Amino acid sequence: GEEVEVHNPADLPDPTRIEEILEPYVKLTIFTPEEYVGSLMQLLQEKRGRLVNMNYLPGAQKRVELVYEAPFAEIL
Amino acid sequence: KKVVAVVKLQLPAGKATPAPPVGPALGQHGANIMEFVKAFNAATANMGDAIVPVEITIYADRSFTFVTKTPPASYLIRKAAGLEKGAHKPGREKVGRITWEQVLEIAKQKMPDLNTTDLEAAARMIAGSARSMGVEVVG
Amino acid sequence: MEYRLKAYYREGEKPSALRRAGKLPGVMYNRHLNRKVYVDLVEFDKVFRQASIHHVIVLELPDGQSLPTLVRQVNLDKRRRRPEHVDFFVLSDEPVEMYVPLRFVGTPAGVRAGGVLQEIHRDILVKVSPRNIPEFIEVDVSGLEIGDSLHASDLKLPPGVELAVSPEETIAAVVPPEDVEKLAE
Amino acid sequence: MLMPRRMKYRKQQRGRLKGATKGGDYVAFGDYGLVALEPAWITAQQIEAARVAMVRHFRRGGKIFIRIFPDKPYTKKPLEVRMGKGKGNVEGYVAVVKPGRVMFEVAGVTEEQAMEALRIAGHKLPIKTKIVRRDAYDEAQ
């Protein structure tokens, strides 16, 4: 059966019965400059997320951006 | 108002999304980044796919320029043996193949490139592209 | 192919004392002769590392009596791993049992998987006349999977040149080649 | 780890470690041997410690020929027990190794590779060692 809750995780129904789950993955926009992107991106490879695209804002050239979907826990 | 360029990349054919590294220096461009999929996948809807390199250069008033090349010897052979992926473990594991002419007709496709104006020299490298993925050449 | 080495005769000299002065005891022999001889170590080492017991070391005896010999056996100091004393068989003309090297011509199919070509014999035994010393002898290893065995009964055989050892004798195998993936069991 | 699948006598007298080897003083299977310089008792688990380090090192490839086998039981008394009262009880196996003994032999491996395997293996061992390459003397034997 389907099931909504609970905020404090331990409870949730046994893997005997459990075929679905949800990590309220947001994707976030980070302005950054220049490249911190290499460092950053990989970081967002551990706390796994999802690139859409985004854009360079104009310069300062170190002007730049990134829109990523990552699960709430990993993100924090 | 960003300075001129001399960009050195290596981008594939078809998959043309603004996703990097079509950006980290191609934003130092204001790069007309969708000009790729049009001007490039028009002449190169004749090969099919594969990484065709690109040397783009920006200038003063924020615009670009490039003249690309040709798709891998690991592509033109993959279609001529019914292969997507190579063979996992080359040298011993053969999946599909290519004849002495099917290797010659490929040098035909990538000749305005390398260095040798030979068909005897060029296809060797193509014949060298053979074992590299495990595709056998019929004697 | 065939070599030359400068033997000197020896009498009652104490073996250990020859040895002391870099010289190596020996004795040459056949149906007819049998004479106490010595040879220089370094001279013989070079010659032997090259010649082994397959070819023909010719002996520069100290009287122009030059002799054509084959090394029948070298006796080693078991401990500090040096040779101690050679034997020299003098060749005649009746065919002589001796050892001819093997050439495993080709790379097997077993390697070309990961295997190991285990060369059981790096030489064979045949009665042949001293005229015809086929200093190599080759084999078709090229057609070899893993779990593949080759026996002397194949084997080309020159002119001609009789297998001393019974044809069922095994000379070659390709074998599984370790694996850390094994082991952990 | 190696040990006689079965035997006749459970324990056996220690003996003495005198002389040089009685046999197997020459490389006779592979292309590269490890040879022994001091005499000692090499213990079932050392041989294994040494084999493994080479396999782990070759990782896939080569053959390993191990030419000592441990068939001498090695006895011990329980801790804190007193003298006498009987002979100890078997606690493992050594093989008896005496200088000039070819212990291991690797094959189908690059010279670079072998001598780094046979070298590590020799660190596992309780004695002093020398690596060697199937001469020609060893073919004359």
Ligand SMILES: [Mg+2]
């Ligand atoms: Mg010497």
Ligand SMILES: [Mg+2]
């Ligand atoms: Mg002990």
Ligand SMILES: [Mg+2]
């Ligand atoms: Mg004891």
Ligand SMILES: [Mg+2]
């Ligand atoms: Mg005891």
Ligand SMILES: [Mg+2]
């Ligand atoms: Mg007692």
Ligand SMILES: [Mg+2]
């Ligand atoms: Mg040691």
Ligand SMILES: [Mg+2]
């Ligand atoms: Mg014997």
